[PDB]
Write a protein that binds this DNA or RNA. Sequence first.
RNA 1: ACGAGAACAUGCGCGACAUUCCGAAGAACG
RNA 2: CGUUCUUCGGAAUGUCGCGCAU
Lengths: 115, 108, 203, 198, 207
Amino acid sequence: NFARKVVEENKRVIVLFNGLTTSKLRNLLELINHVYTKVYNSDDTTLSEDVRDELEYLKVKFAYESGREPAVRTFIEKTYVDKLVDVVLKKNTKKIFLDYCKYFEALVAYAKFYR
Amino acid sequence: NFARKVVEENKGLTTSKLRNLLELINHVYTKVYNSDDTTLSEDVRDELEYLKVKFAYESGREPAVRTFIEKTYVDKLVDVVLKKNTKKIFLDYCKYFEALVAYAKFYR
Amino acid sequence: MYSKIRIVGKIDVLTGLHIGGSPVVRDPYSRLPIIPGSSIKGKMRSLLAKHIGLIPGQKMHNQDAPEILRLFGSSQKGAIQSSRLQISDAFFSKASQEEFDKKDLAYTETKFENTISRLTAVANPRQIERVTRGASFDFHIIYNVENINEVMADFENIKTAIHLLENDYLGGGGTRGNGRIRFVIDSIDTVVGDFDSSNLSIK
Amino acid sequence: YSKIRIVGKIDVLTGLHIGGPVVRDPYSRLPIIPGSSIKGKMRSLLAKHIGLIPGQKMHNQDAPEILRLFGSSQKGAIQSSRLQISDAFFSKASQEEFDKKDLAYTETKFENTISRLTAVANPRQIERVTRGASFDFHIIYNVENINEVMADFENIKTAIHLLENDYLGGGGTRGNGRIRFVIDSIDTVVGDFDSSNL
Amino acid sequence: MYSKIRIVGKIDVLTGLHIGGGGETSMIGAIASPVVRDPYSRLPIIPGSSIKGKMRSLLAKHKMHNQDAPEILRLFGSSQKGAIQSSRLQISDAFFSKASQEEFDKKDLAYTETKFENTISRLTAVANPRQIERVTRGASFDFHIIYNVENINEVMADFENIKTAIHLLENDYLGGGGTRGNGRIRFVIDSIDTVVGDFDSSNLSIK
RNA sequence: ACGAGAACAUGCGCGACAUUCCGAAGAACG
RNA sequence: CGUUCUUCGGAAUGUCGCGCAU
């Protein structure tokens, strides 16, 4: 889908997203994995308040990691990850967040695949 | 919260002073971690009272710190933690301070 | 008159309990950790079989002592014995669920570990998911009274197995700290039959 | 088949660091010494005390005493472990001693990391348990050969003597984690084994 | 035989020793340079990290740390990828000795004293006050290090290097600053024994 | 007065063994 | 008074992966 297109567009000779690796993404992907587990536990059509706050914190973490790492900033701007966080936050639905997590999972999967 | 809009609108406030003030929040944060109470602790209350005293002297030390405090309403949020008397609200305030430090780093 | 003695209680994990399946085994409908009943049954059977004694050069689980084969079951050709013990899956208790919802605990922990290879003096990171220490699982076992005369010896063997299991661990990396558990028996009554189990106890 | 319990205390002579920010028991937020940390450190120290063959990549080719005590996974020679080290939790006595004083369970240590060729410091902030905090440790030993119980407890004593003089995790090289062992009672919790001489 | 040689001795500070540590202090006054203090007994301590780092840097003088000399790379350890080496020196925190604590309790001498300094620019001639917490000159710290005997032949050379390093630490400063004269230190040896193994350290000494 | 009638895909079996969150790192500068 | 304000590696690995009754 979109994830395959962006990973193919960002591939370079193998250099992905200006030198992005799984180790650089590991902190954020672990945070997003924590977010997912809380959503998996939740049984409510609407996102909780706590998950909304920590998704805002995930947005803050995206900004911080992008500021520290040029590769993560390139990944965020090319893959629209932060904007998608804002989109799911304003939509406030569990299924949309699960779709966004699926999108990130596809991103990392194809990144490893072309690695 | 609204850290992004304020930090973008206001973009000699140096990251050094922010990091010192963040360290003072860190010290209160360790205390609230040791507290482990839903209600606001009295020792934590003393910690945040001396924190606002330290906010005042900082303002006296550097005008740039004062502009940051008045524009970000950190002192007003401290008043909010007192007028609410909970630990969840304090943890929210600590995150907001951290967000201001992060956004400041990002826009820098 | 068929006699079934229901023994209900709790398993309090004195240390992190990791029954794999590194995700723990979870009940998909509730997505909460459980103790598989086969884990309790296998650990109890192994401990009690070692305590009673292992037939030298043993190969199968139908060669244990007749005490073990009666209570834990036998599938030997011709000599098939029904299993007295029916150890159900132990589900995460509601009380510990509330106590974990307070303090915002996750009901699980991801213990970080490593192994230092002798040749390289290098460490290989490893994450093991464990149930937190506070958790308690409500366990429910059923005893079938095939022989009324053997109930007392069987409950002595059950007590021995439980006592060994408390000083041992439930499934996981026990030798490295995981899996320590403690049984707290809440009730022992005959759900079915005229049997008088009021004089019985396993812990 | 008897089980003998070795319950006692571990008191930190210096700050104890075991990464996970020290690892804490989530239920009570108190720092703990993982049983795996003690087991690994004792096994490594004892295997160093006994000879080591030049190549032990498999981690299972080692002295037969080590394999008998701590367990083995060699295919066709799977030996069950007799030692079962368990997480040392924060002792209630030490908890109340720290609660009476205005003292935190952990501390933060600040270190410079001065890169000598560039003469620039890179500060780091470590959390480590303050000295004087005690963790109650609990071990179970399963006797399998009554003939080898004396040798196995000799090896356990040697390992504990090594560990008491060594560190337990963290920058022990920089001086974090030195501990002392105080064994209280060694009694056979299951079986007819006698533990008077242990 | 994995022999371990324990060295226990005293460290007496000839000048105020300042070793900083971040944190919060109740009723924190104008002073903003508090010396590192052991939380349990509220006494100044020297972190084994400081001693190890100072001795290693002095020995290296005499891009990364791992590129140093093999002797420095063996005593104090290594982390080169693939060629990871264990560390034979394990320096621990030198806590406040009971003898010095009693000597201070006699006369009620303060453990740590606050010193006033300033830096002035000639063009403006305006001073900036500074208050620094320095451990008083009479204090002594009991240090305890462990040398792991992994190679039998190299122990004598390692202890010669440690003795040189101990002399370098004495000659040079520790903690706050040499140009200021803060942190002068002296090392006296109480007992050097091979606590573990068949090794003997009757002739082995670090001074 | 149904190619029909009566007949548990059931019995036994621990997701387990080996595993150090560790290797190095001065709160330092004039 | 200011400076850096944690960073550099390893992130699981090896095995069993159905067997025994009808």
